[PDB]
């Protein structure tokens, strides 16, 4: 009855870490795009 | 000065008048296009400032 | 083996889902901002 | 009957104003050409950013929907 929950941590942390990856891609994208828009003013 | 062909200089003066009008109107049209370009550029810069403020808000407040 | 068993569900079925829901919320607002900003750039092109 | 001297002076003045106006038009047209070039470059970079964002979003859809 130990691995029945020790498997849910790998799946829950799988979806969580994948979400963190997507959040990293989106955050980096908004940073680069906002930097580009900032370059049109300089 | 010397003599000239009177009718030829009259016709040439009329041609120069029409060419002057046309060239002047081309200048006015080009200047107007430049004015519209400057205005559109300024407005676009304003909108870009708004979007930079928006992304700044959604980035530094999350 | 009660401590080691209930210790698992304390975080992997709670905290790991807490930061996951906060994470998907962040991805939602960031996705919306990217969509409206891309729409703004397309509006500049047209 | 047109007074030859006056008509010659008018010819000279018309050529002068014509050349002057042609040059003002040429300078304004050059400024507009530079503005259009800079705008073309800006629109090109904007197209680059739209390509990047579209690829990112489509990759998120291919990473979550499938
Ligand atoms: Zn004459």
Numbering used by the authors:
A (entry chain D): 503 to 544
B (entry chain B): 1079 to 1140
C (entry chain C): 499 to 544
D (entry chain A): 1081 to 1146
Recite the paper's sentences.
In flies, Centrosomin (Cnn) forms a phosphorylation-dependent scaffold that recruits proteins to the mitotic centrosome, but how Cnn assembles into a scaffold is unclear.
Most of these substitutions strongly perturbed the ability of the LZ to form a stable 2:2 tetramer with CM2, the only exception being L535E, which still formed a 2:2 tetramer but with reduced efficiency. To better understand why the L535E substitution did not more strongly disrupt the LZ:CM2 interaction, we generated LZ-L535E:CM2 crystals and solved their structure. Perhaps surprisingly, LZ-L535E appeared to be folded normally and was largely helical within the crystal structure. This presumably explains why the L535E mutation only relatively mildly perturbs LZ:CM2 assembly in vitro and Cnn scaffold assembly in vivo.
